[PDB]
Point group: D3
Chain length 226, copies 6
């Protein structure tokens, strides 16, 4: 029976996120993956101005992304195309970020997550009523396959994919205890029990910097219909 | 394909709504079609609309104590606006929170156009305050009220030629008073109309629902958010 | 007509709340804040959230437990909490309300202590703050005078420390007060709940939306 | 104390219900330009009843394709019964799942008693199957359907004597046909009745709602759960 | 492996609950400036229990008008039992609907065992009717009531030896009066007990929560469904 | 007519399901579309969700697209919607959602079913066979559910662990062996037939039997 010492607000904050980090790792290590676990947690965390769900992004020209594990998008200003939870059909102009859930962070899964991101970023976003911002993209996994962790070879893998802004992966989380992002230009990496709280707050900081998706004339979606 | 899936999503919903509205018709003693249940239309337009909009059946009220008639689908704000301790299916909605009002009726004909217009007038006649809360060092935003949107949703159109010349002449007659104007309408059999661009624009066929919803969304978007008002006008008269 | 239905829709809820809080007082622990939370949650614009919990700041300090925190969730992240036991960052808080058995000196001082425990918390400016509203909700008023001389002196007394100021209160038996217009304004009778709620909303409106701060101040000292 | 809190919990909801239904009756011009709004009544009876009972506006259907009239408040099963892919506010309900039907109307008088009895008949005339899966003779008791309960909820009572002599004469007349029987009613002004014990039992005053609801529950409980039947009768004709 | 995921699912929830109750302890100065917040325990036991069981904070009432003390977590029926028009967080529960009551306290010690026992007794002393409704043929099935289960939930155990000799003597002393018997308890730091097998069985360590929950499930299961009784006994005294 | 409304409601949902599953195929299918409909249809005594089945000996199934299971008498192992962790004794049926009904995906769905049926179900306090099926957009054979199909299905059903009792193609086909003989329907009523026949089969199983859940904790220390 554990002797529990007295807690304060900072330790409760840390435990509230790290215990959920452990839960997610247990859940993902089993499903070897089911993104539902991650969706629950990031949905619970994000400000209500953000919605997050699995689905497909569409544009007003009728092109679609691949299937995306976690799309972070607007519903406050944006119509719903008569979809339901777990299977969204999301206008491209509503999208803030896309995250792909995979078993591990290696070169194969980073390329696959970048493929997914490019299928969303290539879609057409109207400016009929605007300053569109780049969609944030990332990868979520249990662990990192490299001995190095998120080390030499990992950083080298982003650099070679640096050229194509559509394949860019802005951020990532290994719930075993590592995260990265490039929100500050330089790639910043963290390790350990706070990886989840770091990933989530850094992502919220990046989303915040982008502001609300610009308001657009949704009737571009019906212009070619009869 | 993305465009076909968009078309199909809405058209299959259009067909579902037509079937449900028909299933819901009251049984008459005179062999006519009967009145319809609005609730499935509400669930669809609620699902569709951006979350800044709320929509429900209810009565609109103003700070002088006047009420509208019952409205099948009031589109209104809840992000900035209090609730008057009402319930799903019977909202009691302050007039300053109202964007639009829609009546769900059996058919588009002269009777139900006039009826929907009478409902619309009973909301548009309500008083909307321009009082705002003290703004101490802030730049004052003068409250500019927009006209409330009103419309009709029905199963079909009684005119054999649909939304044709006789329909349009009736709509104009009805809408020759601004309080009674019907901005828009939908027959889920396959027709919709609106005067959002001044000229009456009419569509027919499988895309009537998707056109009606996206056109309404664009009109709502042009209205902006209801202007902030001092809600205490609602308590100023009370003992 | 509409004014009478307006009055009834609130007054019957005032009576329902007085009935439940009256029961809770005879049974008692502390009086159960649940009915009050459900009513003020139903009333408030959706830009405001309201729940029981604890306020926390980026330096790790916490408030006392608060029966009803009115706070933002549209722009503010959730610290992985759940209904009935929120863990709310200080910069998201608009108001705090304590539900107590009665409005008297003891429970006014108690509510003021709870308010100070929230107002002492640090709110970052990293990217100007408004004063948090604080108040008391109770069944009745202990003085046979009501919200009279002894009440005014006691409110004036606690409200001399700005951390302890109680801006407002409600006795669901039929009394409310606030200092939103500087002068203490008192109302009595069947419309106390509707007055309390609309006046509180007007005060909240004047505060504006919580300012957008850089939430990463909450992780800056983690390793 | 506990009994006083019980009384107030129901009587204050009775007052809230009376307030809203009175408003709706006025705004619909006495149920002529619109239907009295049943939403507050639905929320209260849903909240009160055990979860084994569902309640909503809808239309009842049987396996032969016959449909009832629209009903303001159907009390029905969803624990053992499939849903026919509907949404809240307009249910498409198989007849074998129905416990009770209640009509919400402007007033209790001859006109609306006859109207409500006609609605009740449109439901009770539907066919309820006695077919069960694994129907081997001698292995189970045959299904025995119970009589569906029907009633009327209104703002007030129009007769000069309230729920007196003319009322009971009218009730007995519509109820001489088992299909048309009205078992119970509630006037939110403060009166209720039922024939659950054969004798017409009437209550008046502040406890009308609590009596109506507890007496209705007692009648429902005496019926038991809807009998389990073979839902494939609904597809056998297709 | 499925068994490790089972263990971790429950042990991580145990740590989460310990963490939340640890904070509540500190914030309330060990329950001296407010009660420990039961609602995180409620959410977990509500998630775990089969849907035949409802769980919430409230007061138990009987048909004679008597009430219990406030109870942190009543486990009760809603499938067959009416609601007395209450709300989440403050239920007003008929006594015939109650399976179990649990009190969340700062710690397991003599003071709080006695306090949890006094709460349990305030529920068990309430009158449960045996009146039963006749069916359409005039026949009612007699019923018999089971004893209500009661327990205590806390962050830790104050005694140096945990759930050892002093604890056992105190639990036996409290429980020698059946009204006050505490059948079970959980210290979320890592210990649980029950007397479901007519002898006190104690577990400690990382599996305390999963043991407590599954043992309580088994006890509830043995009770069966609450007996079906005539709810109109609640209205028999009213005019 | 009521039967026409009944038919129209289900067939329109069949068409919507076909359209939804077809979009996630062209892109690659997403089972959540199907889960929503079957959940809406089934009596509330049934729960349905994606997840993993587990037994008291710690073994697990493969991931299952749609498990039909009890939550009225059965505890929840502190899971959440979209990834359930379901005791084997709570399970009525499993269904795998795949692009098409053909040999390959019939074998894949049979494999999933075996991974659930192999699990140990305690009798501490007799067990019904778990129902297993496939849901798909269309049928590969030009024959439809033809002679090739029945030959392939009865090959898979030589092992009771791998039996596929039923299946649905939302293009307009369904089958089951609930009556021993394989019964096939085609056309616009495929969804309503599949769902009501499944409902009848579930009804025949009765409620999952009550068990002593202490077997899930017996080996923990």
């Amino acid at each position: 029976a554990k002797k529990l010492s007295r807690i304060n607000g900072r330790e409760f904050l840390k435990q509230s996120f790290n215990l959920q980090q452990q839960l997610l790792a247990s859940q993902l290590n089993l499903s070897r993956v089911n993104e539902s676990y991650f969706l629950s947690i990031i949905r619970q965390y994000l400000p209500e101005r953000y919605s997050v769900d699995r689905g497909v992004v569409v544009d007003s020209e009728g092109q679609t992304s691949d299937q995306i594990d976690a799309v972070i998008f607007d519903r406050h200003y944006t119509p719903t195309l008569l979809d339901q939870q777990g299977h969204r059909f999301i206008p491209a102009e509503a999208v803030y970020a896309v995250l792909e859930v995979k078993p591990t962070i290696n070169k194969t899964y980073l390329e696959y997550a970048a493929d997914k991101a490019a299928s969303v970023r290539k879609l057409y976003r109207t400016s009929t009523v605007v300053e569109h911002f780049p969609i944030v993209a990332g990868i979520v996994a249990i662990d990192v396959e490299w001995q190095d962790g998120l080390g030499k070879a990992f950083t080298e893998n982003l650099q070679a994919v640096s050229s194509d802004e559509n394949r860019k992966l802005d951020c990532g989380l290994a719930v075993s205890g590592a995260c990265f992002d490039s929100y500050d230009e330089e790639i910043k990496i963290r390790s350990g029990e706070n990886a989840l709280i770091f990933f989530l707050f850094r992502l919220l900081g990046k989303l915040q910097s982008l502001g609300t998706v610009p308001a657009i004339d949704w009737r571009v979606y019906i212009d070619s219909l009869e």
